[PDB]
């Protein structure tokens with residue numbers, strides 16, 4: 001069997017050798033180094049691939065798994081909020097999915113600014129947060145939606161759709177059913193906002209580095225990785241793309257931690273099996 005135990009074990013082995021190789025060495029050339037004093041990486045061990053770094057002062061990365069293009073990042077630190085909102089605005093973000101739990105945001109010990117649930121003023125950028133719908137994704141998992149309006153003198157006003165999953169505990173994997181429902185919601189939201197931009201002849205439509213869904217939460221390598229993995233499998237353009245490829249790609253494009261937990265890898269494995277998608281490369 002292609003999804004049997006022998007196959008799973010072999011997948012883990014390759015991915016594990018990959019994780020170990022990608023581990024960040026001190027001043028590693030492959031990873032973005034902190035500009036000069038102010039913290040860059042929320043977690044010293046969880047770095048940002050330099051060749052795909054979106055901004056010099058953010059732990060964020062452009063990620064292309066197959067034909068699916070997104071952006072994965074850590075929860076912006078307090079001091080990176082302005083830069084963070086700029087990335088959001090310039091990317092004409094079709095959708096921002098935040099998989100960090102409400103508990104986490106509330107815990108001031110974690111330094112995770114409640115930047116999307118309330119209005120705020122960071123630098124010369126002023127943000128307007130507005131509540132919209134709320135959607136249950138199954139298993140008691142809830143999607144709280146907002147619209148972030150990025151305003152900045154001299155700059156074009158950009159509104160961003162936000163999908164906030166407030167009860168997906170860190171380092172855990174929700175069911176394949178929920179993950180599937182989530183990707184559908186995120187892909188959907190991104191699709192509607194993109195249509196608006198397309199309908200207005202926005203130039204950002206042709207640029208591949210723009211209009212990318214931004215997914216994250218605390219570190220941007222677990223719940224984030226799982227969602228992005230489920231999102232590429234949702235795109236028909238990725239026929240045959242292996243699970244090995246998917247993770248291999250997320251890791252090389254951000255860090256070797258992408259798809260942090262085994263149960264999170266299982267979910268992608270379950271989904272891929274449901275599509276007859278291969279696990280290993282031949």
Ligand SMILES: */C=C/S(=O)(=O)Oc1ccccc1
Nearest residue numbers: 217218219220221222223224
């Ligand atoms: C976006 C958060 S995560 O993808 O679940 O990754 C993570 C967060 C905090 C500690 C370890 C991993």
